[PDB]
Amino acid sequence: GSVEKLTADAELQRLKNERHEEAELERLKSERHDHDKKEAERKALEDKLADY
């Protein structure tokens, strides 16, 4: 396996966890979305406020 390079499994594993982080942020922006009017939870929310 020229693509394996010892472990292609390890890469698909990292990618699997990478997506976990991305799906969490998906949910985070959903929850915090109502909290932006109260506080700038995160720049992704603060930007919406920061009309530029």
XYZ file of C-alpha atoms in Angstrom:
52
model
C 0.000 0.000 0.000
C 1.812 3.050 -1.314
C -0.902 5.303 0.127
C -0.930 3.448 3.456
C 2.606 4.484 4.410
C 2.348 2.322 7.564
C -1.050 3.574 8.557
C -3.810 5.200 6.429
C -6.100 4.222 9.280
C -4.462 6.795 11.571
C -5.223 9.517 9.032
C -8.879 8.585 8.661
C -8.989 8.529 12.476
C -7.590 12.054 12.758
C -10.008 13.189 10.058
C -12.874 11.522 11.954
C -12.004 13.541 15.069
C -11.429 16.627 12.969
C -15.042 16.421 11.838
C -16.139 15.995 15.484
C -14.617 19.414 16.186
C -16.416 20.876 13.189
C -19.795 19.422 14.115
C -19.408 20.677 17.649
C -18.816 24.207 16.410
C -21.941 23.748 14.262
C -23.914 23.117 17.444
C -21.972 25.717 19.432
C -22.955 28.468 16.997
C -26.540 27.257 17.272
C -26.692 27.550 21.057
C -24.533 30.668 21.397
C -26.544 32.282 18.561
C -29.045 33.593 21.164
C -26.277 34.470 23.574
C -24.581 36.928 21.196
C -27.188 39.543 22.107
C -26.032 39.120 25.692
C -22.290 38.701 25.233
C -19.720 38.195 22.477
C -19.334 34.395 23.158
C -16.945 34.026 20.279
C -15.787 36.076 17.344
C -18.043 33.984 15.025
C -20.926 35.482 17.020
C -19.234 38.832 17.685
C -18.791 39.309 13.921
C -22.549 39.205 13.415
C -22.761 42.050 15.934
C -19.738 43.813 14.428
C -21.539 45.036 11.305
C -18.732 45.813 8.889
